[PDB]
Design a protein around this ligand. Structure first.
Ligand SMILES: C[C@H](CC(=O)O)c1n[nH]c2nc(N)[nH]c(=O)c2c1=O
Ligand SMILES: C[C@H](CC(=O)O)c1n[nH]c2nc(N)[nH]c(=O)c2c1=O
Lengths: 263, 263
């Protein structure tokens, strides 16, 4: 199905053998601008735990560019040293992405799909790292949700390829919970398999999101079963990664799905 | 999609609004032949709890016919009185089914698909209750798993309709974990949607089953995430009921699936 592997510098991720689990890393120190022992040690311990629970990737990430870097760079430096898993930097700022990769991040994860700072795409091309382009927009005035999403996503692919990003370094994300009503988020989940025609790996990010709470009427800490459902549906519909808080659980559900769908 | 409701005497179950949850009821007293306060009270308390957690049906059920009845009849009598949910009797014996329905059971649940005691179908026709015909057989020598299953299931439909069972009183079950290798159970899950062509509601029974343990390499008590996956896939593939131990959890996953697939 995928005739290439996701090359992540020292690590390589096979897109065919299993659904890949992206673990979402935790919390700033109230009295520092970054780098402090408490916050960095907590981060490493969480990365390690997620590694132990079946995570394949560690996702690390309103403040200023300077602060954002002072905060995230120490974390990338420790985790990359002490946890042997590829790291993604959760940013949409060109300069943050540069610093993070220098610091040791392997993948860029951009919630604005390179539309907030097109220059991030250049950073991506330059360092030759995979980049995640999530669907986003500042409004929710659609005429055909899926059609519009695919157009939007495609506008991001163009910015990315125009910058020099190789096809094999592009991953897409439907941006669930972003610029979408609850009913719209459900509709996107329902038609997720349409993203496939674009020909790129898809990452799903639904963990504990508000639309699950809207369906089940449950608070964030009570959303493991709902997250689970969305992950299951997502894998059935062909997604290659899921981005989750509950690594132990979701890793188990994914593995079971994989076995059933034959992956 | 379904132009009829499942009529269960005093209760009616709509097949279209939501995935219906069948809760599996618990444990005999070591010093009695049945009816004892401890075992019946435990049963009622479990039924009540499952009712509270989102169960729509309570499933109640090598020993002799006489013992089987002495044991199950008191339970049906209490639960039916004290828990306002339809009851199914988990038996494949004609006389047990008769006694249970007299006792207050609303649905028959036959793991041998009316092939162990064809007369059970007559009991079904007579009392006009829905009957669940599960796929089973004494061997696993298939030539085309799904094709064979559908033939087998169909042999049960014939026994049932020959006995006078109305189409609207027939429910099917793929019999996962029965007469199937682990790889075969996975294949059945993978192609579950084929059961639909037969035109009857489908109930899925995978809870904590051994094939999940075989995939995840986890013991029975550690199979909630795997059960979850199978339930999710099952609903995506169109099943109308799921039969589960973990009612709270599975009810939540199902409800989320329903919302996503639009049910
Ligand atoms: C806003 C929220 C915050 C969080 O959950 O960490 C958040 N950040 N980044 C994200 N990045 C990707 N690729 N996909 C996502 O769905 C997503 C998020 O939901
Ligand atoms: C054998 C096992 C025992 C149990 O789990 O209660 C068991 N009994 N009855 C059952 N009845 C139906 N309709 N579907 C099933 O999958 C099933 C079972 O797995």
């Amino acid at each position: 199905k995928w005739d290439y592997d996701l090359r992540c510098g020292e690590y390589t991720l096979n897109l065919n053998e299993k659904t890949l689990i992206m673990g979402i890393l935790n919390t700033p120190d109230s009295f520092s601008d970054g780098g402090s022992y408490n916050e960095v040690d907590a981060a490493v311990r969480h990365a390690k735990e997620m590694r132990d629970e079946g995570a394949h990737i560690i996702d690390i990430g309103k403040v200023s560019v300077e602060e954002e870097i002072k905060r995230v760079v120490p974390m990338i430096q420790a985790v990359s040293k002490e946890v042997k898993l590829p790291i993604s930097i959760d940013t949409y700022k060109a300069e943050v992405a540069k610093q993070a990769i220098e610091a040791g991040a392997h993948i860029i994860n951009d919630i604005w799909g390179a539309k907030a700072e097109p220059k991030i795409a250049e950073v991506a091309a330059h360092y030759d790292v995979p980049i995640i382009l999530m669907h986003n927009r500042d409004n929710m005035n659609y005429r055909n949700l899926m059609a519009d999403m695919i157009a939007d996503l495609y506008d991001s692919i163009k910015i990315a390829k125009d910058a020099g990003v190789r096809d094999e370094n592009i991953i897409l994300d439907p941006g669930i919970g972003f610029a979408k009503t609850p009913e719209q988020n459900l509709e996107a989940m329902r038609n997720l398999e349409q993203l496939n025609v674009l020909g790129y790996p898809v990452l799903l990010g639904t963990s504990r999101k508000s639309f699950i709470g809207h369906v089940l009427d449950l608070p964030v800490e009570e959303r493991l079963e709902g997250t689970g459902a969305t992950v299951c549906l997502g894998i059935e519909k062909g997604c290659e990664f899921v981005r989750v808080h509950d690594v132990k659980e979701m890793s188990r559900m994914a593995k079971m799905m994989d076995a059933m769908i034959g992956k």
